[PDB]
Amino acid sequence: YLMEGSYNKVFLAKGNIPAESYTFFIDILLDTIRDEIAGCIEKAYEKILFTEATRILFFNTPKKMTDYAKKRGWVLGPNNYYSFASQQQKPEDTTIPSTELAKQVIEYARQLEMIV
């Protein structure tokens, strides 16, 4: 279930342990998914109010939303989580292909006329 986006069922299993305590393991598991939701807020979403992403984990209103809201963005606002969905700068690169392809075309010319 951790492979796909099964989250809520995983937090049902969390507790729904039939075998024994497993507490030290499900607390590492309680974290290594805390940073996972703490990344899952960072996708292209709308203005999330102070209830939805407040209750997606397992909290009512501590300052753990201040721990993550000051750790990452989606900053504390007027019932507001801020979307800095920019994704702008990285395209329009010809020069890096104008170096790599400058390598590759010469590599074509090496095994084309030069006898091997």
Binding site: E4, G5, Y7, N8, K9, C40, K43
Partner: peptide, 13 residues
């Protein structure tokens, strides 16, 4: 649907 947000969410991620 409540984790169908989340499977699709990983599918972006």
């Amino acid at each position: 649907p409540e984790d169908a947000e989340f499977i699709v969410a990983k599918a972006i991620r």
